């Protein structure tokens, strides 16, 4: 029952700010060394803040690569780990993981969280734009092939995908994001079911949840 | 600072195998006075947050199959799978959380081998409600392959190709260690319009004939 949950992040101007949050629970946060780790794009994980025991004083450590602009902080009454991400540059942008720094004979984190994306760019956000995936019962061959064409938008940080079917037979397919022409993202997600877990006039919807924003769905016709 | 030095940096099975990645530190990383070191080893599946492996340089976290072990002391650390399996596909890092700042190493990613698999492939046509907007885009899916090199052409009508076409692969299946990729060929309603005859045809080892999935339609 030792779980943390991190929030907040997305897309964020350079010079912007943020404030992650890290919501722990089911253990005593007020005596255990709290962790903020990142990791880019294509890179390895990186460690940047450190918060500390209510034992030697809720001291801090910062890499060096954060020195200065990122401020951790706790709100004790509330068991939250916070993250103050004051001017933001592109170099930022990574998935913030909090973690527990256990120590018993050792240290090593026990606990890591889902993570939480923050892309600092100049463009904007743009929703996806859910197009069904769909073939004319002359192309069905059984298997059926259904999908959703999740199109044109910004940024791309975290998509989540899932199909109100699920079972044996059910196969689903999430394909990364593709930088298409107008420098916005593009995916595609089918799912694969028997014939007769999708016969006709039926349907399945797919949802989207895409960074922090609320959920999209589509009704995709077998 | 303390380096973290792991490697190889990629690792190919065939499964069943044994493996061993190794992670040197640029410092000792062993207490003086505890002896213990202060390495942990971290597995990192495809889009999932790392999770414990080892702890101490060789214990092995409460539910981790017994497949995994760790050795070392001092500098030069390792890592061993006795029987590589379809779900170890991962990335595994090594980390100093001996002093301040942490550091980790690039990491090592376990890539199965498997007998060659014939890709299923798949056309969509643009939707309807997506062509009153001004595009079109034909999705055409590749799913479980082997190897990953996988050429996709789009001959849009008599004979094409071009920079209107987007590639992704997806990563290795966790049960197959099999691909899938999709190939989308986005132009616009007028364009898609003129011609007809769409097709998508893949270029596979497995097979000698370009393997063709096809349409033909866009008056209607
Ligand atoms: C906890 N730690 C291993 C990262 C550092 C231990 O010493 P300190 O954290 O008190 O400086």
């Known amino acids: 029952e030792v779980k943390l949950v991190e929030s907040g992040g997305g897309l964020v101007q350079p010079g912007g700010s943020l404030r992650l949050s890290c919501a722990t629970s089911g253990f005593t946060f007020s005596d255990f060394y709290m962790e903020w780790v990142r990791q880019p794009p294509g890179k390895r994980l990186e460690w940047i803040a450190a918060?500390?025991?209510?034992?030697?004083?809720?001291?801090?450590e910062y890499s060096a690569s954060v020195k200065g602009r990122f401020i951790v902080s706790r709100d004790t009454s509330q068991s939250i780990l916070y993250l103050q991400m004051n001017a933001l540059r592109a170099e930022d942008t990574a998935i913030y993981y909090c973690?527990?720094?256990?120590?018993?004979?050792?240290?090593?984190?026990?606990?890591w969280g889902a993570g939480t994306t923050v892309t600092v760019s100049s463009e904007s956000a743009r929703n996806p734009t859910i197009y069904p995936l769909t073939l004319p019962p002359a192309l069905s061959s059984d298997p059926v092939i259904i999908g959703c064409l999740i199109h044109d938008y910004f940024p791309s940080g975290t998509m989540n995908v899932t199909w109100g079917k699920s079972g044996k037979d059910i196969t689903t397919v999430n394909f990364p994001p593709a930088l298409a022409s107008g420098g916005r993202y593009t995916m595609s997600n089918q799912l694969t079911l028997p014939a007769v877990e999708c016969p006709e006039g039926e349907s399945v919807k797919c949802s989207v949840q895409h960074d922090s924003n609320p959920v999209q769905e589509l009704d995709v016709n077998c | 600072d303390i380096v973290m030095t792991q490697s190889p940096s990629s690792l190919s099975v065939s499964a069943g195998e044994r493996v061993t990645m190794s992670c040197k530190s640029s410092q000792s990383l062993l207490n003086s006075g505890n002896q213990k070191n202060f390495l942990a080893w971290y597995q990192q599946k495809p889009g999932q947050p790392p999770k414990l492996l080892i702890y101490?340089?060789?214990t092995r976290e409460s539910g981790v199959p017994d497949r995994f072990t760790g050795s070392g002391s001092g500098t030069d650390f390792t890592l061993t799978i006795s029987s590589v399996q379809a779900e170890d596909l991962a990335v595994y890092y090594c980390?100093?959380?001996?002093?301040?700042?942490?550091?980790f190493g690039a990491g090592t990613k376990l890539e199965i081998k498997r007998a060659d698999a014939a890709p299923t492939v798949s056309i969509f046509p643009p939707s309807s409600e997506q062509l009153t907007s001004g595009g079109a885009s034909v999705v055409c899916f590749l799913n479980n392959f082997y190897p990953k090199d996988i050429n996709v052409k789009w001959k849009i009508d008599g004979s094409e190709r071009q920079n209107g076409v987007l590639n992704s692969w997806t990563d290795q299946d966790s049960k197959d260690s099999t691909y899938s990729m999709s190939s989308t060929l986005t132009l616009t309603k007028d364009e898609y319009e003129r011609h007809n005859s769409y097709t998508c045809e893949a270029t596979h080892k497995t097979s000698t004939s370009p393997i063709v999935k096809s349409f033909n339609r866009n008056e209607c």
């Open positions: 101490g340089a060789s």
């Open positions: 973690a527990r720094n256990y120590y018993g004979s050792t240290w090593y984190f026990d606990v």
């Open positions: 918060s500390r025991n209510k034992g030697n004083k809720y001291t801090t």
């Open positions: 980390q100093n959380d001996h002093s301040y700042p942490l550091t």
